[PDB]
Amino acid sequence: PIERPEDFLKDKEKAKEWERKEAERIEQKLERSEKEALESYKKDSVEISKYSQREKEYKELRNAISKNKIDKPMYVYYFESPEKFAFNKVIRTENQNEISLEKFNEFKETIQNKLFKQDGFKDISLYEPGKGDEKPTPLLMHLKLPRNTGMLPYTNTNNVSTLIEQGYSIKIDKIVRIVIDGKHYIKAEASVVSS
Amino acid sequence: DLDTDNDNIPDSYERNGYTIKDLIAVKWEDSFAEQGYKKYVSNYLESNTAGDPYTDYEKASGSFDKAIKTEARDPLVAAYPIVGVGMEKLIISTNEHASSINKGESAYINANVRYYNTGTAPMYKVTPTTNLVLDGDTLSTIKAQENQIGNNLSPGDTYPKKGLSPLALNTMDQFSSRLIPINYDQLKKLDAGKQIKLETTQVSGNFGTKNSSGQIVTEGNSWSDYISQIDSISASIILDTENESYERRVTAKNLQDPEDKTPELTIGEAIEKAFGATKKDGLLYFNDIPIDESCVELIFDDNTANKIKDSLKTLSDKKIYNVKLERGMNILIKT
Amino acid sequence: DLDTDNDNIPDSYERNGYTIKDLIAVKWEDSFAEQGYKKYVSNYLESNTAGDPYTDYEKASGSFDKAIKTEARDPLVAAYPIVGVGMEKLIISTNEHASSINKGESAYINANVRYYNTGTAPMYKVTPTTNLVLDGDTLSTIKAQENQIGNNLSPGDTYPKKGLSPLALNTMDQFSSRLIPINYDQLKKLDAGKQIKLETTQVSGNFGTKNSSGQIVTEGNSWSDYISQIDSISASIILDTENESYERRVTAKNLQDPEDKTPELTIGEAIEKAFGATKKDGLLYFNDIPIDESCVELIFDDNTANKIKDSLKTLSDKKIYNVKLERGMNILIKT
Amino acid sequence: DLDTDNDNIPDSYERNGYTIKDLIAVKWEDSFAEQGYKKYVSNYLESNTAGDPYTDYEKASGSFDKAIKTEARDPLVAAYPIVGVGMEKLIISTNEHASSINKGESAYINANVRYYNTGTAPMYKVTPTTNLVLDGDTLSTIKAQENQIGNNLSPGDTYPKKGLSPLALNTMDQFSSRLIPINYDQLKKLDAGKQIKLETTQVSGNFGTKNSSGQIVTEGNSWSDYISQIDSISASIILDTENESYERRVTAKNLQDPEDKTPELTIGEAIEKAFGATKKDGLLYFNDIPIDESCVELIFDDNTANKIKDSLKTLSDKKIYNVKLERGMNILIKT
Amino acid sequence: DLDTDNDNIPDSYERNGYTIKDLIAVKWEDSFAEQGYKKYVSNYLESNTAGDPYTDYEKASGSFDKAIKTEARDPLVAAYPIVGVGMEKLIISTNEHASSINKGESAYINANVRYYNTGTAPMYKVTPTTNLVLDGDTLSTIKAQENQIGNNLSPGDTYPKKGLSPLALNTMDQFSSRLIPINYDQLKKLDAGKQIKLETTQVSGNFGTKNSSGQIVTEGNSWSDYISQIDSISASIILDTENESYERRVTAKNLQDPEDKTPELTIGEAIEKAFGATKKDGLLYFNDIPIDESCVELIFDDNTANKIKDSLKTLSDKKIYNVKLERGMNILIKT
Amino acid sequence: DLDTDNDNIPDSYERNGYTIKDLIAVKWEDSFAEQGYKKYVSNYLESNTAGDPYTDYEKASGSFDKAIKTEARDPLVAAYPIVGVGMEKLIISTNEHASSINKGESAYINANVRYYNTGTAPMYKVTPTTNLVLDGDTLSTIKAQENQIGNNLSPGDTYPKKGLSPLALNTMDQFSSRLIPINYDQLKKLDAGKQIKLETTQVSGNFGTKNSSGQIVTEGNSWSDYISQIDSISASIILDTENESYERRVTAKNLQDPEDKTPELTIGEAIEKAFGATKKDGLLYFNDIPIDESCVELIFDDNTANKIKDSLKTLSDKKIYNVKLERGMNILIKT
Ligand SMILES: [Ca+2]
Ligand SMILES: [Ca+2]
Ligand SMILES: [Ca+2]
Ligand SMILES: [Ca+2]
Ligand SMILES: [Ca+2]
Ligand SMILES: [Ca+2]
Ligand SMILES: [Ca+2]
Ligand SMILES: [Ca+2]
Ligand SMILES: [Ca+2]
Ligand SMILES: [Ca+2]
């Protein structure tokens, strides 16, 4: 982390370059155990994540990624399905471009003055993922992560992803109504209150 | 409720007509006709209906480089910069040594040129390849170098804008350091009274994509990647008004392909969509001038003429503007 | 509470007026006028209302290149550098061989130039493409090379600053090793008493974007990527003071486009916002000299003149300054 | 249900025949012939059956560069630009100093050339290597430089399109700053009446692929990576019509390889699939002229003739259009 | 506790003054004056205050290249290398042919020059663009090539250091392979007794950014990206001692902009912060020579003179060291 | 069931023999030889047993650049393109000055050359470095420039294919601008009847991988990174037929390393695997002509002859096709 802001606002090139640099600078600092460990998550990403949401892989990864703590606070963006947000209803489907100011306020009332828990192995990005990146869900996140949290980049196959473990509590603040690539998403800024 | 090409336009809307409100897609109703909204019908199978670099949603919403004209926002009209080069004056410089003459490099030519744009798109780094011909003898083919490069060729504008002098082409080397040679025979032909013509074989340019939030990059984005695609799936329409010319290309449906789902357009519908003309009393008017068939002159080539006659013999309306527009037709309209 | 285009300004704030305090957006009130705050209105559908690379939030909060004049902090005014090149002297270097002359390489011209910025922006790598003309004949169109590239053109400043000699312009090659030629015909035409004129066909450059914490990036961010868009969605207002010239481009609405949600402005309001004038006693003052319609001379071209005649014959107040400004009118203010 | 080569087409579908509806693969039925669908058989063990860079799914669905002809949609026909160079005139410039002659650089040649594409694919940066031969001696080989590079070469089209004069070629240096020399010996041989021929050795180019949201990209994707593979696993079929020539390359099965699972084709079926001909009344017609063996002339080389004679003497039907097509056969059809 | 501009120093500390203890910031007290620590106050709305690339945290902590003078650690002073070129001698070479002379290239020049740094920073790759003038006509404008590029120009030092001979400037091309020509008229003007002068229009340099570990990067970072910003938010103060000069820039507040939260400074405070002077007996001393108003001579231009004139009629103390420091004044102090 | 170097091939399969079926390796049995399969044995410690860039699994399955010959599918045979240059004619250009001669640049040569590939691989950008020698004195060593670079040298073919004229090589600078000089002494030696020979020192080129998603990349993948590896762990075997020459490199085993686990091959098995010969009645047949030791001439150098003598004296069969093949042997086969 030689030089990097809290948030790379809509900067894909700088995020990718810095994530390459940190992936290299971590790969030539780590040991062989996580070298043979992270491939398991790399090729069964859903399995180990939905298991950590037989313990050798989880323990090795937790130990190897609770050791790369970040100093500056950061802002991260990931797409999160609003099915774990106590929103048991549906908001949209994948291609229905319309969101309504009748379920927008319902989402506002559902997530308000409530600290939702969020813990588990997962994947995030370093920038605003619009116009070209995958858009699996109509809820973008704007988590704010404090100092001393786990972080590691890793190059899957010439493409770079990033893993974080979390003992988190999201603590939402507001909800924007972004329209990007002709679609109505909710951008949700949140501030971590660590337990 | 379904999207196959994932262009952020649902399949039913793309087939039955849709409009863009608040950068989002909705069904077209008759109430939006009087508000200034237009009806967009596009292909529901691929991401780009006209083949131009902007997708169906970007074209329909106008979320692209804003210098693109309004009539290119229809998905069936291709955002396409048609760039020409007009020659204004030619200078002949004989390098006779006085104190002698060389019979291979006896003359150097300064060609005054000016770039013209006529399509619905700006070419952000204009690089024409121009060959100078003299009695059928192509003297030299010169690509525009760094000195003669042109940025910001807005539609309907000239790179040396009105009130500015033409640009000077005098160098054939890639770095503008070597002057254009002319030998003794073609110098004698030029002095006899023959005139050098200038032709444009290709134009290489760039298009700006609205990357991130308002950022525009015109590096690595070349129009030559889509020149062939647009010239393949389209038909060319040219209007020659007394003061300006307008060249566009309209997407056409293929009967031989069952999986080609581009919407059917007549020639009249194609003209209206490609030109933004207004329907007054049923007729078509383009900027307060008549454009309907009975008031203009139509010129076609052999292929378009044969197709038009055969399809009119098949049809019953016996009107050129009421026949289906096929792929690869040249139509020139003069007023 | 609802933002469509992601500029961190909500739609209600953008439509009804807003101001920037401690790098956040709040509603505008009349009580904020005495402190020195200004009322801002922008487009709630477009990330960049004016077309310049800086978004509405960056322009309103002033989180940009601080050398940009404060009149461009308004989102409706385009941060857009207007760079001209003034010609101060011309030097003839005839290469006579004395111990012989060549009528194709008879002279070398060294032109003394000096850059002039008049827009509301610094243009970080000024590279003018200038053509030399005589008798209406274009001598050479040459782009400035690395010797002649003048970085840092501040607003209202010349690249050879006050007290410094003009820049020298004598090489046509990309690497400055070939001098500009003149053949004997136009050498004798210059000797006959004619004068070389210089024109600036275009000027290429860069703008400094903000990256990391306080970092300014100028590489790969060219102005020509946005010049065409700005010149499309704007109108030009030129004040001609006795000692300086001020050129601005102000975004104006389109009536034929219902989705164009840029705020409506009058020509007088546009002049006030572009030049940073002060509304005193109902009159407009810009730096202790009157600027109102009855005190200055307004000059337009043909389309703008007829536009204002139509709008005046349709209007009731019968005054120029309170009429709607629309996209593509040229205004010249002379005091 | 199972896919081995990971090309989004099931192995059973690829082996039994399939067609693409709604950009997805379904089993073929006889009722789909009346809708215009064409039967597709591919290889389930290799991703790209023909060897061209587009996969079997992209080729069958038509989701590639849309300028590719419809005949190349069948996965057994390789999208392959056959590009040649044609001389139209030769201009000789004698380099005599008149007040003297040099015996090493006595003459310069202006070669007027025109490109010709005939295969079912467009090449996006046509850089050919032309060797100028005279009396059995190769005067020079010249790769096209930036001035002679021709982009957007659609099939059946010339880079200087019909109506434009041919392109000039006069420099051998990579930057066009050195004319082609000819010494006194070949100058005298040319003056004696011997004519310069031109041949094409290699032709480099690019092809368009799909990149993320940036759509068509053409830089870094050269044909020279794939033309070796295609020319290896194919048989070349040439049609000679008095208007145009058609060169195709149809993939062939290797009998001695038990992993080569490419579909088995006869010569008649291969010609029909290569040219998109229609089989009516038993015979094959290509654009309403007959193509059957009783109406055309077939020309082979020695290896193809011996292969065809042996296979005919082994076969019982004794028809050239009914015999198995092997690898590396050259067939020319004259009408 | 709360930080807005995000420079690792809270806004309360930024407004009330701060100092650095063990690479962290604490609230400033008067007790730290005796230990040598100074008082730092900066702008809580800008990541970097003075306009220089380094953030306020790095400037206060000294965590950058240590060749910067220790008074520039104050955030309100600008890390800003002001350099010039001192021409020491001229060598002229008239290239006559003895067995002839060319009137266009009759002479060449060898300009012996030496770089002079006076700012509070080095440029790690000095590249001056200097023009050579003779009786008002500019001979040539030359940017330094790779031969004349000087690294490590430390403050108060020359690039050819003391005891070394001046550098030679003789080439105009980007690669040093073309000498500077002089025609016959300027040759005669030189030989008549007139002297060629030299001026520095611009200097291109690099600033070294320091990473978390020991790593200084000076590639891709330019001063020209920030010198406009510094000249905008800065005011120039010049000190002229007999043996050395000291040029500095101190950020000034704008009273018309409510959001310009840069700290308020007087002229005397600005001078003492920009030169690291100490308060002895109430007066100010800079290296054992009095600098106060009654002992030195202060020179300004017309605009600065008028500014201090009106501010002095408003002020009651009538002291030029107690007058408000506004944007863009030029001060020359001669002792 | 255990893989040591994770090359998709189990250790037991690699040691005891395997064949490929449906792109997965299975144990080899005697019943598979009737269907056209072959027996593959490789080294279970090195991912590339022959040193060529393709993995053992890729070589066995044939999932590489498909123009590689079928006999290089055996992992022990090295995919290695042997490229030579054959000189067909010499063009002599004497640059006498007629109206003089310079004895330092008195002659210019234009060598007509043609490339020959003999190995089992196509070499995708052929760049030969050839020296022109004259009675032992090397006149000049030229690496082929952009004009002379020939892509697509397929195995058993020439870069100017059968039917085209030889390529011309006439310049030695990188950007092809200056011809090859010959001085007075060498010109007179040429006129006296001596001839110029052409030898090839190195040939640089590329190869095709498939590491990208369904694409072939031949930029930065040079053969020069592997020819030394193959020449180290390989033994060269050359067959000389009347119409063609076939040169192969078969990897051998070292008896001084206990970890070099490559299969042991005799010279008979090596020849059969390297040329794809068929065992008919015990003898070896390649293209229907016998190559058995009784009916062929075998040529060895001195070291190979000494090795063959010392190894035959300790053998009971006294047959050259039975002795173990060693590392770095040269065997020439002439029928
Ligand atoms: Ca759709
Ligand atoms: Ca669509
Ligand atoms: Ca907005
Ligand atoms: Ca906005
Ligand atoms: Ca398959
Ligand atoms: Ca397949
Ligand atoms: Ca702060
Ligand atoms: Ca600060
Ligand atoms: Ca293995
Ligand atoms: Ca192995």
Side-chain angles (χ1 to χ4, degrees), chain B residues 20-24 35-37 60-62 64-68 70 73 89 91-99 108 110 112 122 124 146-154 159-161 163-168 170-171 174-179 210 213-218, chain C residues 4-6 11 44-48 51-53 55 97 100-104 129 131 133 136-143 145 172-175 177-178 181 183 185-186 199-202 204 207 209 220-221 223-229 231-233 254 256-259 261:
Chain B
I20 289 324
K21 298 170 59 96
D22 281 35
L23 292 199
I24 214 65
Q35 290 344 280
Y37 285 150
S61 88
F64 41 59
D65 180 27
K66 290 286 187 329
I68 282 160
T70 322
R73 287 153 87 132
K89 183 154 286 303
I91 320 295
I92 312 101
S93 312
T94 63
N95 64 319
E96 263 143 28
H97 220 295
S99 66
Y108 297 132
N110 224 27
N112 297 357
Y124 273 130
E146 212 76 82
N147 290 359
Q148 294 100 50
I149 217 65
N151 328 84
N152 316 141
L153 192 60
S154 310
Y159 159 66
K161 322 212 67 149
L164 283 170
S165 38
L167 164 150
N170 44 9
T171 45
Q174 180 165 341
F175 326 124
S176 273
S177 156
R178 174 151 211 290
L179 261 66
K210 223 182 190 56
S213 83
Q215 283 294 340
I216 280 193
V217 61
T218 83
Chain C
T4 308
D5 52 348
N6 195 207
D11 295 12
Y44 77 103
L45 278 187
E46 224 191 317
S47 187
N48 313 51
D52 36 358
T55 174
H97 261 277
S100 164
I101 200 66
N102 196 357
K103 37 203 103 179
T129 304
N131 53 346
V133 305
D137 251 25
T138 297
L139 255 199
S140 280
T141 287
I142 58 196
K143 187 178 172 98
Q145 305 105 26
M172 95 176 303
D173 198 6
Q174 195 182 323
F175 323 122
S177 58
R178 179 114 158 88
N183 40 337
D185 307 283
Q186 25 184 346
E199 276 135 5
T200 88
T201 284
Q202 73 174 355
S204 195
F207 61 95
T209 196
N221 295 338
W223 271 117
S224 285
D225 308 344
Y226 305 90
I227 276 169
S228 95
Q229 170 173 167
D231 274 26
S232 177
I233 42 170
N254 193 301
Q256 341 283 320
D257 195 297
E259 209 225 10
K261 298 283 174 52

Side-chain angles (χ1 to χ4, degrees), chain C residues 65-82:
Chain C
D65 191 343
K66 300 292 186 333
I68 282 161
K69 296 219 106 159
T70 173
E71 314 140 352
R73 272 169 59 102
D74 186 58
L76 298 164
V77 187
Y80 172 80
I82 292 98

Side-chain angles (χ1 to χ4, degrees), chain C residues 198-217:
Chain C
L198 179 137
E199 276 135 5
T200 88
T201 284
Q202 73 174 355
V203 167
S204 195
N206 284 318
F207 61 95
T209 196
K210 196 99 150 193
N211 223 28
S212 286
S213 192
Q215 270 294 331
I216 286 195
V217 178

Side-chain angles (χ1 to χ4, degrees), chain C residues 2-11 14 42-47 49 55-56:
Chain C
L2 183 148
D3 189 11
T4 308
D5 52 348
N6 195 207
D7 42 347
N8 266 340
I9 289 106
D11 295 12
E14 220 150 348
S42 319
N43 190 352
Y44 77 103
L45 278 187
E46 224 191 317
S47 187
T49 313
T55 174
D56 297 332

Side-chain angles (χ1 to χ4, degrees), chain B residues 2-12 14 42-47 56:
Chain B
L2 175 80
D3 208 2
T4 315
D5 43 352
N6 48 74
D7 47 350
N8 321 287
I9 293 164
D11 259 333
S12 39
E14 197 140 44
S42 163
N43 160 280
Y44 77 99
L45 271 199
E46 75 274 344
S47 197
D56 298 339

